Each structure stands twice: as C-alpha cells, then as structure tokens.
PDB file of C-alpha atoms in Angstrom:
ATOM      1  CA  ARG A   1      45.270  23.538  62.687  1.00 42.90           C
ATOM      2  CA  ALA A   2      41.460  23.544  62.509  1.00 41.15           C
ATOM      3  CA  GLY A   3      41.066  26.239  65.186  1.00 41.24           C
ATOM      4  CA  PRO A   4      38.307  28.859  65.154  1.00 40.59           C
ATOM      5  CA  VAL A   5      40.551  31.873  65.950  1.00 37.51           C
ATOM      6  CA  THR A   6      43.030  30.552  63.366  1.00 35.98           C
ATOM      7  CA  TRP A   7      40.284  30.518  60.681  1.00 38.28           C
ATOM      8  CA  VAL A   8      38.428  33.660  61.864  1.00 38.61           C
ATOM      9  CA  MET A   9      41.703  35.509  61.327  1.00 38.76           C
ATOM     10  CA  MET A  10      42.398  34.000  57.920  1.00 38.78           C
ATOM     11  CA  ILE A  11      38.806  34.844  56.904  1.00 38.54           C
ATOM     12  CA  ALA A  12      39.106  38.475  57.972  1.00 38.78           C
ATOM     13  CA  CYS A  13      42.385  38.976  56.117  1.00 38.00           C
ATOM     14  CA  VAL A  14      40.845  37.606  52.965  1.00 38.95           C
ATOM     15  CA  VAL A  15      37.684  39.720  53.265  1.00 35.74           C
ATOM     16  CA  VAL A  16      39.749  42.897  53.877  1.00 33.72           C
ATOM     17  CA  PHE A  17      42.222  41.951  51.057  1.00 35.48           C
ATOM     18  CA  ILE A  18      39.375  41.425  48.573  1.00 33.69           C
ATOM     19  CA  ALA A  19      37.945  44.757  49.763  1.00 31.76           C
ATOM     20  CA  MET A  20      41.370  46.232  48.942  1.00 32.32           C
ATOM     21  CA  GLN A  21      41.144  44.854  45.387  1.00 32.32           C
ATOM     22  CA  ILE A  22      37.673  46.344  44.818  1.00 31.08           C
ATOM     23  CA  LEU A  23      38.178  49.762  46.497  1.00 29.82           C
ATOM     24  CA  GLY A  24      41.967  50.051  46.116  1.00 30.07           C
ATOM     25  CA  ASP A  25      44.775  49.832  48.701  1.00 29.87           C
ATOM     26  CA  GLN A  26      44.776  53.459  49.717  1.00 30.67           C
ATOM     27  CA  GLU A  27      41.052  53.679  50.312  1.00 32.73           C
ATOM     28  CA  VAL A  28      41.133  50.745  52.700  1.00 32.98           C
ATOM     29  CA  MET A  29      44.263  52.193  54.295  1.00 34.74           C
ATOM     30  CA  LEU A  30      42.616  55.495  55.201  1.00 34.19           C
ATOM     31  CA  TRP A  31      40.281  53.512  57.460  1.00 35.96           C
ATOM     32  CA  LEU A  32      42.375  50.555  58.695  1.00 35.62           C
ATOM     33  CA  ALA A  33      45.893  51.994  59.009  1.00 36.98           C
ATOM     34  CA  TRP A  34      47.414  53.087  62.301  1.00 36.62           C
ATOM     35  CA  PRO A  35      46.232  56.685  63.198  1.00 32.25           C
ATOM     36  CA  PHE A  36      48.271  59.076  61.038  1.00 34.33           C
ATOM     37  CA  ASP A  37      46.655  61.992  62.834  1.00 33.73           C
ATOM     38  CA  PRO A  38      46.379  62.299  66.644  1.00 32.85           C
ATOM     39  CA  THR A  39      42.874  63.589  65.960  1.00 29.45           C
ATOM     40  CA  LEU A  40      42.160  59.967  64.819  1.00 28.89           C
ATOM     41  CA  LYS A  41      43.703  58.455  67.937  1.00 26.82           C
ATOM     42  CA  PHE A  42      40.338  57.423  69.374  1.00 24.49           C
ATOM     43  CA  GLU A  43      39.442  55.287  66.342  1.00 29.20           C
ATOM     44  CA  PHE A  44      40.724  52.315  68.446  1.00 31.13           C
ATOM     45  CA  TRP A  45      40.316  49.596  65.740  1.00 29.45           C
ATOM     46  CA  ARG A  46      43.237  51.083  63.823  1.00 30.56           C
ATOM     47  CA  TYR A  47      45.653  49.814  66.533  1.00 29.34           C
ATOM     48  CA  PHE A  48      44.755  46.304  65.427  1.00 28.59           C
ATOM     49  CA  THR A  49      43.296  46.473  61.895  1.00 25.94           C
ATOM     50  CA  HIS A  50      46.640  47.294  60.280  1.00 26.05           C
ATOM     51  CA  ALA A  51      47.358  43.542  60.829  1.00 22.19           C
ATOM     52  CA  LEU A  52      44.507  42.748  58.393  1.00 27.91           C
ATOM     53  CA  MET A  53      45.864  44.610  55.373  1.00 31.17           C
ATOM     54  CA  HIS A  54      48.006  43.031  52.597  1.00 32.72           C
ATOM     55  CA  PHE A  55      49.383  44.483  49.390  1.00 33.30           C
ATOM     56  CA  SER A  56      50.012  41.381  47.240  1.00 37.31           C
ATOM     57  CA  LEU A  57      48.864  37.785  46.836  1.00 35.36           C
ATOM     58  CA  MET A  58      52.390  36.911  47.866  1.00 35.97           C
ATOM     59  CA  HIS A  59      52.201  39.134  50.969  1.00 36.26           C
ATOM     60  CA  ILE A  60      48.928  37.603  52.186  1.00 35.64           C
ATOM     61  CA  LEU A  61      49.591  33.953  51.230  1.00 34.04           C
ATOM     62  CA  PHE A  62      53.021  34.036  52.802  1.00 38.19           C
ATOM     63  CA  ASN A  63      51.516  35.553  55.968  1.00 36.49           C
ATOM     64  CA  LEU A  64      48.512  33.275  56.137  1.00 37.89           C
ATOM     65  CA  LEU A  65      50.765  30.272  55.576  1.00 40.57           C
ATOM     66  CA  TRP A  66      52.892  31.085  58.623  1.00 39.08           C
ATOM     67  CA  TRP A  67      49.781  32.132  60.565  1.00 36.19           C
ATOM     68  CA  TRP A  68      47.971  28.867  59.803  1.00 39.44           C
ATOM     69  CA  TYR A  69      51.068  26.818  60.673  1.00 37.95           C
ATOM     70  CA  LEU A  70      52.035  28.752  63.834  1.00 36.67           C
ATOM     71  CA  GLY A  71      48.628  30.134  64.880  1.00 37.29           C
ATOM     72  CA  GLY A  72      47.138  26.665  64.457  1.00 38.51           C
ATOM     73  CA  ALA A  73      49.697  25.102  66.854  1.00 35.43           C
ATOM     74  CA  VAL A  74      49.101  27.638  69.622  1.00 33.75           C
ATOM     75  CA  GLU A  75      45.323  27.358  69.235  1.00 29.71           C
ATOM     76  CA  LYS A  76      45.341  23.533  69.304  1.00 30.76           C
ATOM     77  CA  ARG A  77      47.951  22.999  72.065  1.00 32.22           C
ATOM     78  CA  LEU A  78      47.170  26.050  74.216  1.00 32.77           C
ATOM     79  CA  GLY A  79      43.653  27.230  73.485  1.00 32.06           C
ATOM     80  CA  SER A  80      42.024  29.992  71.552  1.00 35.99           C
ATOM     81  CA  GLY A  81      42.421  32.526  74.360  1.00 35.03           C
ATOM     82  CA  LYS A  82      46.219  32.314  74.468  1.00 36.50           C
ATOM     83  CA  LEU A  83      46.244  32.893  70.695  1.00 37.08           C
ATOM     84  CA  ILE A  84      43.960  35.966  70.821  1.00 36.23           C
ATOM     85  CA  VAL A  85      46.038  37.533  73.623  1.00 34.63           C
ATOM     86  CA  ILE A  86      49.236  36.943  71.622  1.00 32.75           C
ATOM     87  CA  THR A  87      47.557  38.381  68.523  1.00 31.05           C
ATOM     88  CA  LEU A  88      46.207  41.504  70.295  1.00 29.60           C
ATOM     89  CA  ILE A  89      49.384  42.337  72.250  1.00 30.26           C
ATOM     90  CA  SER A  90      51.643  41.900  69.232  1.00 29.49           C
ATOM     91  CA  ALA A  91      49.282  43.692  66.859  1.00 30.02           C
ATOM     92  CA  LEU A  92      49.180  46.565  69.352  1.00 25.43           C
ATOM     93  CA  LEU A  93      52.942  46.648  70.170  1.00 25.93           C
ATOM     94  CA  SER A  94      54.348  45.897  66.736  1.00 25.08           C
ATOM     95  CA  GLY A  95      52.061  48.460  65.153  1.00 26.05           C
ATOM     96  CA  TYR A  96      53.247  50.886  67.806  1.00 26.77           C
ATOM     97  CA  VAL A  97      56.933  50.353  67.126  1.00 26.07           C
ATOM     98  CA  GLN A  98      56.515  50.245  63.361  1.00 24.85           C
ATOM     99  CA  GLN A  99      54.784  53.611  63.376  1.00 22.30           C
ATOM    100  CA  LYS A 100      57.843  54.981  65.243  1.00 21.88           C
ATOM    101  CA  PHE A 101      60.290  53.390  62.791  1.00 20.85           C
ATOM    102  CA  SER A 102      58.808  54.576  59.504  1.00 20.80           C
ATOM    103  CA  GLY A 103      55.387  56.146  60.193  1.00 21.68           C
ATOM    104  CA  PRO A 104      51.771  54.945  59.845  1.00 26.09           C
ATOM    105  CA  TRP A 105      51.638  53.392  56.319  1.00 23.26           C
ATOM    106  CA  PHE A 106      52.073  49.706  56.800  1.00 22.60           C
ATOM    107  CA  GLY A 107      50.111  46.563  57.356  1.00 18.67           C
ATOM    108  CA  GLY A 108      50.247  42.812  57.259  1.00 22.19           C
ATOM    109  CA  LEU A 109      50.124  40.009  59.761  1.00 23.45           C
ATOM    110  CA  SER A 110      53.943  39.608  59.944  1.00 22.21           C
ATOM    111  CA  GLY A 111      54.087  41.504  63.236  1.00 20.72           C
ATOM    112  CA  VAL A 112      51.738  38.973  64.810  1.00 21.61           C
ATOM    113  CA  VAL A 113      53.670  36.257  62.873  1.00 21.58           C
ATOM    114  CA  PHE A 114      57.156  36.967  64.278  1.00 19.48           C
ATOM    115  CA  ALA A 115      55.451  37.101  67.686  1.00 21.75           C
ATOM    116  CA  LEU A 116      54.128  33.620  67.016  1.00 21.62           C
ATOM    117  CA  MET A 117      57.582  32.546  65.726  1.00 26.80           C
ATOM    118  CA  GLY A 118      59.255  33.982  68.826  1.00 30.84           C
ATOM    119  CA  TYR A 119      56.611  32.434  71.080  1.00 28.99           C
ATOM    120  CA  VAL A 120      56.527  28.893  69.633  1.00 34.16           C
ATOM    121  CA  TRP A 121      60.308  28.580  69.605  1.00 37.41           C
ATOM    122  CA  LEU A 122      60.930  30.083  73.098  1.00 36.28           C
ATOM    123  CA  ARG A 123      57.970  28.099  74.500  1.00 37.47           C
ATOM    124  CA  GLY A 124      58.951  24.802  72.875  1.00 38.26           C
ATOM    125  CA  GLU A 125      62.440  25.383  74.216  1.00 35.46           C
ATOM    126  CA  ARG A 126      61.644  26.221  77.842  1.00 35.49           C
ATOM    127  CA  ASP A 127      58.321  24.315  78.172  1.00 35.63           C
ATOM    128  CA  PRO A 128      58.566  21.223  75.893  1.00 39.43           C
ATOM    129  CA  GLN A 129      55.514  19.673  77.653  1.00 34.74           C
ATOM    130  CA  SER A 130      53.381  22.436  76.080  1.00 36.72           C
ATOM    131  CA  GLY A 131      53.502  20.320  72.892  1.00 40.27           C
ATOM    132  CA  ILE A 132      54.574  23.102  70.471  1.00 37.30           C
ATOM    133  CA  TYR A 133      57.933  23.855  68.920  1.00 39.40           C
ATOM    134  CA  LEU A 134      59.726  25.469  65.986  1.00 39.98           C
ATOM    135  CA  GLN A 135      62.209  23.609  63.763  1.00 39.84           C
ATOM    136  CA  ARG A 136      65.644  25.153  63.867  1.00 36.50           C
ATOM    137  CA  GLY A 137      64.961  24.653  60.194  1.00 34.49           C
ATOM    138  CA  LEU A 138      62.568  27.576  60.387  1.00 30.52           C
ATOM    139  CA  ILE A 139      64.198  29.868  62.881  1.00 30.25           C
ATOM    140  CA  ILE A 140      66.884  30.067  60.258  1.00 26.95           C
ATOM    141  CA  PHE A 141      64.502  31.525  57.728  1.00 27.17           C
ATOM    142  CA  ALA A 142      63.051  33.513  60.430  1.00 25.66           C
ATOM    143  CA  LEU A 143      66.397  35.156  60.863  1.00 24.29           C
ATOM    144  CA  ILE A 144      67.038  35.331  57.171  1.00 22.95           C
ATOM    145  CA  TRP A 145      63.668  36.908  56.716  1.00 21.94           C
ATOM    146  CA  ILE A 146      64.145  39.583  59.378  1.00 17.97           C
ATOM    147  CA  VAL A 147      67.672  40.529  58.262  1.00 18.92           C
ATOM    148  CA  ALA A 148      66.562  40.552  54.613  1.00 21.62           C
ATOM    149  CA  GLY A 149      64.081  43.290  55.513  1.00 19.18           C
ATOM    150  CA  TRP A 150      67.022  45.222  56.952  1.00 19.87           C
ATOM    151  CA  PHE A 151      68.571  45.189  53.466  1.00 18.89           C
ATOM    152  CA  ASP A 152      65.224  45.782  51.676  1.00 17.18           C
ATOM    153  CA  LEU A 153      65.563  42.525  49.685  1.00 14.05           C
ATOM    154  CA  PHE A 154      65.321  43.351  45.955  1.00 12.94           C
ATOM    155  CA  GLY A 155      63.263  46.516  46.573  1.00 17.13           C
ATOM    156  CA  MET A 156      60.882  44.853  49.087  1.00 16.46           C
ATOM    157  CA  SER A 157      59.968  47.547  51.610  1.00 15.61           C
ATOM    158  CA  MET A 158      59.450  45.526  54.802  1.00 13.89           C
ATOM    159  CA  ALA A 159      58.062  46.805  58.128  1.00 16.67           C
ATOM    160  CA  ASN A 160      61.340  46.288  60.067  1.00 14.71           C
ATOM    161  CA  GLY A 161      59.999  47.656  63.364  1.00 16.59           C
ATOM    162  CA  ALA A 162      57.020  45.348  63.179  1.00 17.14           C
ATOM    163  CA  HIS A 163      59.163  42.238  62.788  1.00 19.84           C
ATOM    164  CA  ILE A 164      61.591  42.892  65.627  1.00 19.86           C
ATOM    165  CA  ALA A 165      58.897  44.300  67.971  1.00 18.09           C
ATOM    166  CA  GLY A 166      56.646  41.348  67.257  1.00 16.23           C
ATOM    167  CA  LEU A 167      59.550  38.944  67.682  1.00 14.59           C
ATOM    168  CA  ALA A 168      60.539  40.533  70.999  1.00 15.54           C
ATOM    169  CA  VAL A 169      56.968  40.471  72.279  1.00 17.42           C
ATOM    170  CA  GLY A 170      56.510  36.745  71.554  1.00 18.49           C
ATOM    171  CA  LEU A 171      59.759  35.936  73.373  1.00 19.85           C
ATOM    172  CA  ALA A 172      58.658  37.969  76.458  1.00 15.21           C
ATOM    173  CA  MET A 173      55.230  36.265  76.513  1.00 14.61           C
ATOM    174  CA  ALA A 174      56.741  32.771  76.030  1.00 13.96           C
ATOM    175  CA  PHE A 175      59.388  33.353  78.712  1.00 14.50           C
ATOM    176  CA  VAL A 176      56.835  34.631  81.188  1.00 15.51           C
ATOM    177  CA  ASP A 177      54.509  31.730  80.147  1.00 20.18           C
ATOM    178  CA  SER A 178      57.387  29.255  80.652  1.00 22.58           C
ATOM    179  CA  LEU A 179      57.717  30.098  84.360  1.00 23.55           C
ATOM    180  CA  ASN A 180      54.170  29.226  85.375  1.00 22.64           C
ATOM    181  CA  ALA A 181      53.008  25.558  85.439  1.00 20.45           C
TER     182      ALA A 181
ATOM    183  CA  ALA B   1      55.720  53.538  49.429  1.00 20.02           C
ATOM    184  CA  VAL B   2      53.899  51.337  51.945  1.00 20.31           C
ATOM    185  CA  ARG B   3      55.745  48.796  54.184  1.00 16.29           C
ATOM    186  CA  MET B   4      54.784  45.147  54.443  1.00 14.96           C
ATOM    187  CA  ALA B   5      54.686  43.637  57.922  1.00 17.87           C
TER     188      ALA B   5
END
C-alpha cells in the first residue's frame, strides 16, 4: 500500500482537484482535458492528464480509494514500473476510446481503475503466485458499477467508454503478463 | 455535462 507511485498519483489528483476548486472545473479542463481540437493534438500531456481531474469529493475519494487498494497491490507485489506502465497505457487507451464515445469532456482515474480491476483479477486468476487477487466480492461491484454507468445511475453521467476500454486493457495486459514466468 | 471516468 505504501508505494511511491501509488502516493505520487494520489498526491497529483489532490493537487489538481484543489486547483479545480480554486480556478473552477472548466478552467482546469481547458488545459488538462483530452485535445478537443486537432490543433491541440501536440499538447501530449492531455492524453494522460484527463486521469487527474475529478468533479466531486465523491468522484475523487471513490477513485482514490480503489486506486490505493488496487494500485497499492500492484506496486507492492509487482513493482512500481509495472504500475506506471498499466497507468500510462490505460490512461492513453481509455481516454482514446472515451473521446470516441462521447467526446473530449471527461476525466477521472476510473479508466486506470477498471484497468487495475481487470488486471488484478485476471492476474490473480491465471498467475496466483504473483501474490495479488480480487475478491469475487468486488468484481461484482465492478460489474454493477460498469453496468450502472450504462443506465446513467440517478443522473450520474459516467464515462462508459473509459470503463470498458480500461477494463479491456487491464485484461489484455494481465493475460499477456500471465504467460511469461 | 461532463462525464466522470
């Protein structure tokens, strides 16, 4: 749990979030969101910094919770490098698919989070010796959570492309990772 | 609106 990449990520999300409370959501979005304009396509940070933005205490705490719990496990059991790679690929791919689904105005760490969910479960399943796993007790919620976004649970506009893309990506990485060693 | 990942 006490991993550097785990905490460096939690710290950044909290910095950025606080910045969002001072400046306002939209003003942070114009700089951190996925490129809305192909002119902006070379502002490379935007492909990753959308993961840093949250729009409610609930949004961020719920995300950081999962991230601490799942990110922690991968960092501890598998190193900081494996975590970063998972975070970068899924922030890049789930941003990418989410932009296709509903455009460039989104953010949150849930893309990376479903990738961690997908990864920890598929990896604990195929490579038990890797010392990580996900309670079926969680994978349930996982699936409630994803399908509840499909129905926009009580007006909650969820990034549905991000969740599934992230989920898929984690499963691919864990499956590939569960062939070596 | 915005969508929450």
